[PDB]
RNA sequence: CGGGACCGAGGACCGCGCUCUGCAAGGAUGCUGGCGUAAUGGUCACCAGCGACCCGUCUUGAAACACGGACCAAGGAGUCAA
RNA sequence: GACUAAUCGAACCAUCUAGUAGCUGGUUACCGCCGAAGUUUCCCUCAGGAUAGCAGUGUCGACCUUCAGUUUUAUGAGGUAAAGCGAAUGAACUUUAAAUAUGUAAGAAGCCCUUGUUACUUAACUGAACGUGGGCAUUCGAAUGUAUCGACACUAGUGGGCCAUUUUUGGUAAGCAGAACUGGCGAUGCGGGAUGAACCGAACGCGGGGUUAAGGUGCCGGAGUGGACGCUCAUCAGACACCACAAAAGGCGUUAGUACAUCUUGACAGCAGGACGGUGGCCA
RNA sequence: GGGAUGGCUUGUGGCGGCCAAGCGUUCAUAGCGACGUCGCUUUGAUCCUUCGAUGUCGGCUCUUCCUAUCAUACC
């Protein structure tokens, strides 16, 4: 994998470039799950 | 192709610990000079025995002169030549006084009749035909005929190209 | 001329056409001359030539 | 095998995983390690564009990375030169401590008596028949 | 044609002063003669610094001279090819022998009052033509507002 | 050992040399003839052999297209201040 | 949307006003010294930007340290050719080992040893890191080249152009389209390809002599109706061809060959003769 | 303020299968394959199935050329 020098300089220690896509996927899943839980709570209130 | 000479070229693989006395390979090469002769030797050795020039060495290069250059001989040449179809066998005959002269006549003949260049021709055998009965081609058979004698009709006389104008019309009878 | 033959000719000091130099034959020089073979003619000079 | 920051490594992609993989240029390249990971490693590789060099940083999985023997000859020669110079000072005899290129071969004579040469045609007659 | 991958480089240093000071021209002639006819590297350095512009000749103060006069240099002749200025923070001027391009009035007065000697560069050429027992001093070149803003 | 062509930079001596009374050795001298003026040389006009697109300007990578130019004189466009 | 003094989808006159334009046009003596460039990297694109790179003038610093689009050596990648298997085993076999270009490394600024600490690491004073001291100048540890240094300052154009060899990725009925390196051109004259952006040779101060390159030597046209051996006759031959037409194509054109076959027990071509009987075989 | 495919084309369909002289291969018997051929595309009928302009053609008047010939000449 090609690595940008600025991104690897700003990268925290211990983390690798091989987990970035899993991190992004986890963030997207977390946002979608939060929206689903909000919809469920509103529907249960109704 | 050129003023050719025949060279005995002897070469070998470079000696190693496993092979302290490598085999000697000998070839007869028709070439304009010794550099071309050694290059053709290494080309054929690479094509045959997988011995490279970098791992090999030249042991000897000698000129093989004709034994009787004043004796008229008939020569048979077995060659293979490469065309767009592929490789073709050929047996031809030449009436010359030396093997080198026969080989040059062969190169001129191949270039004239089949457009075969030097690099597409492999000379496999050059032999002197020991008997008159060994001659196969009619263009040599008519020359080896008994009591051969011919005239020369319509001989254009040799006139200097710098003498533009002539006062008499030339004759073509001598 | 490509950059590698150009650099080899510069290191051999053959900067002009019909320039000539003496070279001691080693492998390290022979490979250089073999690379610049499309621009040079070379050989073994005798005492009269030298 | 574990790697540390600063050592020299070679990159060799091995097996069926080298099939359509996007960066074929870095295969067979040698670089210096800057980052260490349990399953990966960070390598600095220099590229040449015209007269100048540029620096690229790559992440390579450790199954495609081997330690290099680039400086092994230099360290071996340094050690050998040290011991040979010490031995030369002990014995009072100069010795050659520099590599030299390969020289042209000298003159020698090759005998023929048990090694008679074989005459070869451009093609083999046993192949002709 | 001749293939020239490398280029012959014209000189990137001053060969002559840009100034029109006639006395500087006479000093330059004298030190050209000295640099040609002597082996002393001091003369060549002095000639080259005489060629120099003003930002390349920063002033040297009496406190800087007094700092460099310590540790066995008290009897050497101080050579500056710039202006020697006075430092009022230095309350006691040591005895010194200074040859400079020019002096400020207070620096000259304080050197002569401490009992030292003030010379010009032609007097320095007369007394030390080979630069023997000299201490060559330069001022702080990077102590300029433009250099700070670079 | 012959035959021919082009050239003669420098301007006391100094040097390397040699075949050493001197020389072909760190760059041409010697002898002779005609003429001493348009003879050599030069300028202009024309013929002859060979050579040779119409200038800016624009465009893009470049050409082509396009635009300006009947001719001449005089003005005529990177200045001053902070 | 007609007319309102040849002026009207808002008259005419003067002023603000030398209004603004990123678009068009133009922008004035000579010589000398240098001398360029087209995704490098980042930013939401087009009606986008910076920025790397390449240049010139000044200087200064010991213009000190040497460095290098190159080879060699060691080791990677390419094990890929190849030799053998009277070595084992069976491109995937191996003792050995290709070609093209290609990465890394090749010293005193270096190498090694020793002592401690560690906040790294290790079962661990163990490795490694940081310091400490010492040894190694007997050669400074390949070749070749080396008017090729460094650091500032200020200034300027160009920074997603065209063509081509090679490598590579895709395609089309056929065309072709992306990248990478390199070379050329835009900026460039000269000799030759009759002619000319992309071809070959060769790069340019003013002159004289000599010799060549590519290309040429029947005349135009400087140089050969030059030499040797052959081939070819075209009812618009051919002479700068490779691509297409276009096929394993059609030729009682002409040569040189290869294979198979017949031949004094008479081949191939002819001429003179035979070419018979069951039998008008069966069905229709 | 700019700007205004081309030595092309012609007379014989496509798709699928088969055969096939040959090319290759003969430690694999695969893969190309001209010539062909086979299948999809009313007893001289029906006349009660006309299936979309973005692309533009014209006419005089007059001359010449090509041949891929309708007529005239010959075969």
Swiss-Prot record, chain A:
Record field: transmembrane:
none
Going by the entry's taxonomy, the superkingdom of the source organism is recorded as Eukaryota
Location in the cell reads: Nucleus
What does the UniProt record say this protein does? Involved in ribosomal large subunit assembly.
**What is the similarity comment for this entry?**
Belongs to the RRS1 family.
Q: How does it assemble?
A: Component of a hexameric 5S RNP precursor complex, composed of 5S RNA, RRS1, RPF2, RPL5, RPL11 and SYO1; this complex acts as a precursor for ribosome assembly.
What's the protein name?
A: Ribosome biogenesis regulatory protein homolog
Q: Which organism is it from?
A: Chaetomium thermophilum (strain DSM 1495 / CBS 144.50 / IMI 039719)
């Amino acid at each position: 994998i090609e690595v940008s020098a600025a991104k690897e300089a700003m990268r925290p220690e211990g983390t690798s470039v091989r987990g970035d896509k899993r991190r992004e996927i986890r963030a997207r899943v977390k946002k979608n799950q939060k929206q689903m839980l909000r919809n469920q709570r509103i529907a249960a209130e109704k | 192709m050129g003023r050719l000479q025949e060279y005995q070229v002897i070469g070998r693989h470079l000696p190693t610990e496993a092979n302290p006395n490598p085999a000697l390979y000998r070839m007869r090469i028709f070439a304009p000079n010794e550099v071309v002769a050694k290059s053709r030797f290494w080309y054929f050795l690479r094509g045959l025995k997988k011995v490279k020039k970098a791992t090999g060495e030249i042991v000897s290069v000698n000129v093989i002169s004709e034994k009787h250059p004043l004796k008229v001989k008939n020569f048979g040449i077995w060659l293979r030549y490469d065309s767009r179809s592929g490789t073709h066998n050929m047996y031809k005959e030449y009436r010359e006084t030396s093997r080198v002269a026969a080989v040059e006549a062969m190169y001129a003949d191949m270039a004239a009749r089949h457009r075969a260049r030097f690099r597409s021709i492999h000379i496999l055998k050059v032999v002197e035909l020991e008997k008159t009965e060994d001659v196969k081609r009619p263009y040599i058979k008519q020359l080896v005929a008994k009591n051969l004698s011919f005239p020369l009709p319509h001989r254009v006389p040799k006139i200097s190209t710098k003498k533009i104008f002539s006062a008499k019309r030339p004759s073509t009878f001598s | 001329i490509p950059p590698k033959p150009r650099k080899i000719l510069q290191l051999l000091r053959l900067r002009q056409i019909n320039n000539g130099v003496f070279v001691k034959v080693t492998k390290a020089t022979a490979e250089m001359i073999k690379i610049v073979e499309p621009w040079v003619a070379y050989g073994y000079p005798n005492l009269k030539s030298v | 095998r574990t790697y540390r920051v600063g050592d020299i490594v070679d990159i060799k992609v091995n097996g069926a995983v080298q099939k359509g993989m996007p960066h074929k240029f870095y295969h067979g390249k040698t670089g210096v390690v800057y980052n260490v990971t349990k399953s990966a490693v960070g390598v600095i590789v220099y590229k040449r564009v015209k007269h100048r060099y540029i620096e690229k940083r790559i992440n390579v999985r450790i199954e495609h990375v081997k330690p290099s023997r680039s400086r092994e000859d230099f360290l071996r020669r340094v050690k050998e030169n040290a011991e040979l110079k010490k031995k030369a000072k002990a014995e009072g005899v100069p010795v050659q401590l520099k590599r030299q290129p390969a020289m042209p071969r000298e003159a020698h004579t090759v005998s023929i008596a048990d090694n008679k040469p074989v005459t070869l045609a451009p093609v083999a007659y046993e192949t002709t028949i | 044609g001749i293939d020239l991958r490398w280029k012959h480089v014209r000189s990137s240093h001053r060969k002559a002063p840009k100034s029109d000071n006639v006395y500087l021209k006479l000093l330059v002639k004298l030190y050209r003669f000295l640099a040609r006819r002597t082996e002393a590297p001091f003369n060549k350095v002095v000639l080259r610094r005489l060629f120099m512009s003003r930002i390349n000749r920063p002033p040297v103060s009496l406190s800087r001279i007094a700092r460099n006069l310590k540790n066995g240099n008290e009897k050497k002749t101080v050579v500056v090819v710039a202006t020697v200025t006075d430092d009022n923070r230095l309350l006691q001027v040591p005895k010194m022998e200074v040859a400079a391009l020019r002096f400020t009035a207070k620096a000259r007065a304080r050197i002569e009052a401490a009992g030292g000697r003030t010379l010009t560069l032609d007097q320095l050429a007369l007394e030390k033509p080979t630069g023997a027992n000299t201490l060559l001093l330069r001022g702080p070149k990077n102590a300029r507002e433009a250099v700070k803003h670079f």
